[PDB]
Amino acid sequence: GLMQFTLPVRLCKEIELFHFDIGPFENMWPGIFVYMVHRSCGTSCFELEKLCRFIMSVKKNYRRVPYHNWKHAVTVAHCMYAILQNNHTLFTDLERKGLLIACLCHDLDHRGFSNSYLQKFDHPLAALYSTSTMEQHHFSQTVSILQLEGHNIFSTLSSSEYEQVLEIIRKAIIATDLALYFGNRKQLEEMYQTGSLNLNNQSHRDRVIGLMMTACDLCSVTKLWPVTKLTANDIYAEFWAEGDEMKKLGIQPIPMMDRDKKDEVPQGQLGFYNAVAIPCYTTLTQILPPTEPLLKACRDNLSQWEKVIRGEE
Ligand SMILES: CC(=O)Nc1cccc(-n2ccc(=O)c(-c3ccnn3-c3ccccc3F)n2)c1
Numbered sequence: 599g600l601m602q603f604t605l606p607v608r609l610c611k612e613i614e615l616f617h618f619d620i621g622p623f624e625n626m627w628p629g630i631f632v633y634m635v636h637r638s639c640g641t642s643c644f645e646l647e648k649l650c651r652f653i654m655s656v657k658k659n660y661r662r663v664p665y666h667n668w669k670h671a672v673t674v675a676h677c678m679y680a681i682l683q684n685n686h687t688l689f690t691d692l693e694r695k696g697l698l699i700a701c702l703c704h705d706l707d708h709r710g711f712s713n714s715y716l717q718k719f720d721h722p723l724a725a726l727y728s729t730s731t732m733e734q735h736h737f738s739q740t741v742s743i744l745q746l747e748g749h750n751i752f753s754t755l756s757s758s759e760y761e762q763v764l765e766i767i768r769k770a771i772i773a774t775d776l777a778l779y780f781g782n783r784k785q786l787e788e789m790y791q792t793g794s795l796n797l798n799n800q801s802h803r804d805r806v807i808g809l810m811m812t813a814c815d816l817c818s819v820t821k822l823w824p825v826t827k828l829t830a831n832d833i834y835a836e837f838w839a840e841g842d843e844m845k846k847l848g849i850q851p852i853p854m855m856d857r858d859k860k861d862e863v864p865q866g867q868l869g870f871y872n873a874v875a876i877p878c879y880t881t882l883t884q885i886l887p888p889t890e891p892l893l894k895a896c897r898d899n900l901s902q903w904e905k906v907i908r909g910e911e
């Protein structure tokens with residue numbers, strides 16, 4: 599009960615910032631997550647014994663892939679921590695509980711392949727879940743782990759609170775399907791602009807939580823340039839492996855996934871910043887002003903990629 603987690607001074611201070619990098623010491627990441635739960639939620643939200651057992655089972659069920667791995671899980675959870683801490687009074691106790699867990703679990707058992715590759719391969723999961731294929735699998739994996747003996751971190755919640763938090767977690771994980779982001783952000787853009795955005799409207803909160811999930815999921819593009827640039831390598835290592843597997847199915851991959859077209863990555867990054875990342879953080883900053891540093895950091899990285907093209911690096 600009186601057992602706090604305490605980080606070294608540099609981490610204690612920098613973990614509060616949006617651009618925090620969780621570092622290369624894997625064995626400190628569970629402790630970093632618990633620290634964030636305790637400050638974001640309370641030392642009472644979860645039983646430490648059950649939480650620690652849940653975290654280590656989640657870790658085991660992430661695969662050794664270049665990008666969609668345990669480090670991504672904890673990175674995405676830290677961005678959500680930074681959003682929640684900078685918007686103290688806007689979120690319920692259940693929401694803060696649900697969303698950190700949703701972020702830790704959002705890519706459970708990822709193989710490093712897109713929904714499109716699963717469908718073209720004719721993977722069994724594509725027959726089970728026709729849309730948001732991997733995201734329905736990630737939620738399924740989350741429910742499976744919660745149901746292991748001694749792993750139900752929500753046990754002290756009432757029956758209705760339990761149904762609510764699992765519904766927050768389901769919608770949050772489904773919302774990390776980037777195919778769904780484009781329409782979600784458009785709707786939020788319309789609602790903010792016409793003044794009809796109402797955070798007491800559950801359908802509206804759901805949409806805002808959706809956008810927070812996209813923002814946390816993409817947060818590699820909101821780090822300092824050296825982190826963003828080095829993470830790009832891991833992201834493209836998966837894209838190129840998927841490209842190889844498309845060629846093995848007798849399909850020419852889109853240039854983004856073709857390792858013969860590495861020359862075109864810098865211009866491909868501009869499109870992604872301009873079509874996806876900047877619009878995401880812009881709409882997020884409009885709804886939640888204290889998340890502005892994500893947009894500023896994203897714009898700085900856009901400027902760095904422009905410099906790569908202009909041959910200045
Ligand atoms: C451009 C478009 O319209 N669609 C699209 C679709 C999927 C991927 C990317 N893509 C390209 C370049 C990147 O750096 C990233 C990117 C940056 C941080 N995270 N992701 C990311 C990685 C894997 C899966 C989804 C992700 F969002 N994503 C673009």
Ligand SMILES: [Cl-]
Pocket residue numbers: 663664709710711835836839
């Ligand atoms: Cl891979």
Ligand SMILES: [Mg+2]
Pocket residue numbers: 704705732774775
């Ligand atoms: Mg995902």
Ligand SMILES: [Zn+2]
Pocket residue numbers: 670674704705774815
């Ligand atoms: Zn993800």
